Ligand SMILES: O=C(O)[C@H]1O[C@@H](O[C@H]2[C@H](O)[C@H](O)[C@H](O[C@H]3[C@H](O)[C@H](O)[C@@H](O)O[C@@H]3C(=O)O)O[C@@H]2C(=O)O)[C@@H](O)[C@@H](O)[C@@H]1O
């Protein structure tokens with residue numbers, strides 16, 4: 181039988197602050213249900229150690245969405261509220277099966293748009309450089325479709341071993357740290373000033389596959405939203 185993520189202590193803090201959306205943004209499991217042992221092939225404990233997400237289908241997801249802690253409702257915060265908002269993770273990205281082309285593994289999202297997606301990418305050129313099998317950040321600085329609305333950055337080549345990420349937002353600026361090294365340093369998020377509906381996400385969100393049957397798979401060794409105010 182499949183082992184539940186809540187059967188160990190590692191992920192209990194974030195599970196107390198998230199709902200699971202699967203296979204779309206529809207509710208699969210509340211925070212209470214996650215803490216109570218919700219499990220399926222889409223969301224189970226691998227190797228006694230990893231919170232593993234799996235999903236097939238274009239634009240489908242198996243993803244945690246940040247909630248107010250202790251049974252609360254959906255959270256919404258602003259890039260310019262003066263608080264530092266932080267998400268941390270340690271992720272093992274396996275080799276992806278044929279047909280999977282991009283898997284979003286962490287986000288900042290709002291009611292209307294993704295401010296930030298960190299994604300694995302099979303193949304893409306950025307600023308005239310071709311990259312394969314790598315982790316990318318995609319930041320929106322507008323809501324349009326033209327390339328001027330996005331800042332897309334190579335973060336790191338995918339590693340077999342765990343890779344650490346940290347996302348920080350403070351005073352309308354974004355920092356992304358990968359394996360302890362700052363890769364994105366103070367990216368401007370001020371376009372989003374006053375949007376009070378932002379939240380963190382993490383898991384597997386499958387983008388532009390070439391086969392809707394192909395199953396994306398992502399293993400988390402750690403995941404947390406870090407509260408700089410220590411509300412207790
Ligand atoms: O390599 C490129 O720059 C390609 O960008 C394509 O447009 C992207 C866009 O930059 C961005 O990555 C966007 O991301 C969306 C995501 O895939 C999901 O649909 C959801 O999260 O919404 C995201 C968003 O709207 O920000 O996806 C588009 C896209 O549809 O591919 C094109 O410009 C492409 O021609 C170009 O090669």
Ligand SMILES: O=C(O)[C@H]1O[C@@H](O[C@H]2[C@H](O)[C@H](O)[C@H](O[C@H]3[C@H](O)[C@H](O)[C@H](O)O[C@@H]3C(=O)O)O[C@H]2C(=O)O)[C@@H](O)[C@@H](O)[C@@H]1O
Nearest residue numbers: 201204205206207245253254287289290291292293294381
């Ligand atoms: O286009 C998407 O799939 C976006 O969905 C976003 O989640 C929303 C979405 O409305 C979703 O259906 C669900 O809606 C909830 C909503 O949270 C509301 O507050 C209440 O919980 O009932 C609604 C419902 O059950 O329909 O959750 C929403 C949310 O903001 O959490 C995100 O998953 C986006 O990332 C996505 O692009």
Ligand SMILES: [Cl-]
Nearest residue numbers: 238239387388
């Ligand atoms: Cl799409």
